[PDB]
């Protein structure tokens, strides 16, 4: 929340003259706040557009820098910390699946508009079933690939 201002002289407002001049890049975004509009906005001063010209060189000392690594790209943590994670996620997905089965056995000859009618929450398939699959796939694929690389890069 940063802003820049300048004054408008009193007598000019009484005369027909308005504060400035117009070309079409005035009106983007620059909706004044009501809070500011309560005080002397326009009546006493006007806002000026602001922008941050981040030139080259200082760009890279931020983008390619605040986050990075090197050897961290090849770390395994293959003990129980992995197997225990798998045996938590699959365990709870067992109940998610049983829920979805029950939640579809209804098979009533109604119309999906009525389904939306009573639809409120916990839409099993999309709400939960799928994110568990995506997480499990990600973790296991990455782990196996890293092990297969280290098995050849070192002896």
């Amino acid at each position: 929340v940063i802003d820049a201002f300048r004054l408008i002289n009193a007598n000019m407002m009484v005369l027909g003259h308005e504060p400035r001049q117009t070309t079409s890049n005035l009106g983007h975004l620059n909706k004044p706040s009501i809070q500011a509009l309560i005080h002397g906005l326009n009546r006493h001063y006007y806002s000026i557009t602001i922008n941050y010209r981040k030139n080259e060189l200082e760009q890279k000392m931020l983008l390619n820098l605040h986050k990075k690594s090197w050897m961290e790209g090849l770390t395994l943590q293959d003990y129980s910390e992995h197997c225990k994670h798998n045996e938590s996620v699959v365990k709870e997905m067992l109940e998610l699946a049983k829920n979805y089965n029950k939640a579809v056995e209804e098979e009533d000859k109604m119309t999906p508009e009525q389904l939306a009618i009573k639809n409120v929450g916990k839409q099993d398939p999309k709400r939960h079933l799928e994110e568990h699959v995506d997480v499990l796939m990600t973790s296991n694929i990455v782990q196996c690939l890293a092990a297969m690389l280290d098995t050849v890069v070192f002896k």
Binding site: M137, I141, C144, L145, M148, L149, T151, V152
Partner: protein, 50 residues
Amino acid sequence: DYAKKRGWVLGPNNYYSFASQQQKPEDTTIPSTELAKQVIEYARQLEMIV
């Protein structure tokens, strides 16, 4: 005739020659180059559908 090309000895009663024993030699634990291919392929078909 067999002795000229085939193994063992020609009526020795104690054959001496080359052996036909076969050993798998599957000790190598490195199918890494191809198995890595397979895994990358699974990642390939988890994406690029939009």
